Amino acid sequence: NCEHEEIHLAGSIQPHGALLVVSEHDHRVIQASANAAEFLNLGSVLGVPLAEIDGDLLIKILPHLDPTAEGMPVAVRCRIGNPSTEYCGLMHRPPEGGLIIELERAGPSIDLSGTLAPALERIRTAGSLRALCDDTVLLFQQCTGYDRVMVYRFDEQGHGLVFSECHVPGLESYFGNRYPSSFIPQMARQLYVRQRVRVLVDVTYQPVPLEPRLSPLTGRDLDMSGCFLRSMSPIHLQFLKDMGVRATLAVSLVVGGKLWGLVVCHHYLPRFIRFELRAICKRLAERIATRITALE
Ligand SMILES: */C=C/C1=C(C)C(=O)N/C1=C\C1=NC(=C\c2[nH]c(/C=C3\NC(=O)C(C=C)=C3C)c(C)c2CCC(=O)O)/C(CCC(=O)O)=C1C
């Protein structure tokens, strides 16, 4: 590889959310994505006390600052700005740098009450790894609506194989394609064992830089390992561009503490899935991983 890009130190986010970093000691926003004020209908954000941004959010955050019961990551409802808009705030604490709050607009979410059960039932009947992975791609297509869904499985040599695939009729089948191990470097795989869902809304996005770049608390790049809005490697973006893919969802399949493979979805237009469905997807994938795990 390809093992040297520090993808967790991206210094920037995708533009469909905003990112705030709050000091644990004084609760001011000490670092933010450059779009944050525009995104949140605020005049300014940098240097502003969280009490000014939204008092109710500060109240929600305070108990999480107890080192004996941090209770993060956590997803909280809040209303920010004037005019006021509802957001889901996804908050976590990196080892150093302060408290990170990533905000997505609340919006319509996909409804799974009539369609999730038949797909889950099918998974439950799978008696082989073939059946299980085929059923996995149908389940995730049915829950998410992506144009193409794959199980990307690492073989015994670490090569990537598109082991199962479904897609809307007329699109290219990547089923059976095999790729070098370095197309997903070990450093990336290691991150994906911890950060189990990634959503790339538009491959062509203009990265939104953090302001300032370096954390004021450390003088170093912000650790963005746990940020759902993190900008992704330009090499990977280029890969997807050269395929003509416009958007992706990927969910880790973790077996034995290692990345066994991924559920990888492609869309040919921009696409976002909101917090709850990301969580559902993460969980489904863990359940499927338990079954793999049992199947060999
Ligand atoms: C030499 C390094 C690389 C080459 C060559 C390359 O093609 N990519 C290289 C590095 C990275 N890959 C990263 C992530 C990544 N790559 C893939 C590969 C595929 N996705 C597909 O859909 C297909 C084919 C159908 C392939 C072969 C995947 C699935 C991922 C993870 C994507 C995700 O989680 O969304 C990567 C890190 C990206 C990042 O997280 O920032 C690098 C540096």
Side-chain angles (χ1 to χ4, degrees):
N1 332 38
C2 314
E3 298 293 344
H4 308 288
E5 190 177 358
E6 291 177 289
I7 64 176
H8 67 294
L9 303 177
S12 66
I13 63 161
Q14 295 176 61
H16 62 271
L19 186 157
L20 307 178
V21 185
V22 173
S23 62
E24 307 167 51
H25 45 258
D26 89 343
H27 324 123
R28 294 180 175 272
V29 177
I30 56 171
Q31 184 170 210
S33 52
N35 72 331
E38 228 149 70
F39 188 93
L40 297 173
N41 286 127
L42 297 176
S44 59
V45 316
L46 201 51
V48 172
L50 203 57
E52 261 171 31
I53 309 276
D54 184 58
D56 288 345
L57 174 63
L58 172 56
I59 292 163
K60 290 171 208 120
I61 288 165
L62 284 178
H64 293 283
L65 295 179
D66 182 342
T68 65
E70 293 201 31
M72 279 180 290
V74 65
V76 297
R77 237 193 21 164
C78 55
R79 305 191 53 98
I80 304 169
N82 197 223
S84 148
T85 295
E86 190 169 289
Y87 298 91
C88 183
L90 291 306
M91 179 169 71
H92 78 280
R93 185 183 69 80
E96 47 179 29
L99 178 71
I100 293 169
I101 307 173
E102 288 182 292
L103 292 146
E104 69 185 40
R105 286 197 211 291
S109 64
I110 291 169
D111 176 19
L112 305 180
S113 69
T115 55
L116 165 71
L120 277 184
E121 179 119 327
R122 195 189 293 120
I123 284 270
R124 290 198 304 261
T125 70
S128 64
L129 184 61
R130 165 58 52 206
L132 181 73
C133 294
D134 282 2
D135 296 342
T136 291
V137 302
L138 295 171
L139 168 64
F140 280 78
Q141 209 280 324
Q142 298 161 17
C143 288
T144 74
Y146 281 79
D147 286 332
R148 179 185 298 108
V149 181
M150 295 164 286
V151 171
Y152 189 96
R153 177 182 176 196
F154 301 112
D155 71 16
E156 78 281 355
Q157 312 173 66
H159 289 72
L161 177 66
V162 178
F163 179 72
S164 289
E165 180 197 31
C166 67
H167 56 71
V168 300
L171 293 185
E172 185 168 0
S173 295
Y174 292 135
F175 183 69
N177 282 356
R178 195 174 67 202
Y179 298 91
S181 63
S182 59
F183 284 26
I184 312 179
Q186 291 300 330
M187 53 83 163
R189 299 191 195 188
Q190 285 165 192
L191 178 57
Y192 302 154
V193 165
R194 323 187 267 122
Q195 185 72 182
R196 294 186 180 184
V197 180
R198 285 72 61 196
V199 180
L200 174 62
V201 168
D202 182 346
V203 72
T204 72
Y205 77 97
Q206 183 182 37
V208 180
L210 296 178
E211 70 172 300
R213 175 187 163 177
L214 304 173
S215 169
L217 284 177
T218 64
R220 304 178 281 289
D221 277 304
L222 187 66
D223 181 355
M224 302 186 69
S225 300
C227 292
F228 88 90
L229 300 166
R230 179 182 59 83
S231 291
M232 302 181 88
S233 172
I235 290 298
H236 178 57
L237 299 177
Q238 191 73 53
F239 168 80
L240 291 174
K241 286 173 183 181
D242 288 348
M243 290 201 271
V245 170
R246 196 72 187 274
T248 62
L249 162 66
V251 188
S252 295
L253 295 161
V254 180
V255 176
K258 301 200 147 110
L259 200 63
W260 184 93
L262 296 191
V263 183
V264 183
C265 313
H266 297 165
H267 217 57
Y268 289 95
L269 289 170
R271 189 153 189 84
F272 182 58
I273 59 159
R274 300 192 131 70
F275 159 72
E276 189 188 21
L277 184 53
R278 296 196 306 266
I280 286 163
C281 283
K282 177 174 166 183
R283 185 60 187 158
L284 293 173
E286 294 167 349
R287 293 164 63 129
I288 290 160
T290 293
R291 290 282 316 284
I292 285 171
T293 68
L295 278 156
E296 268 197 32

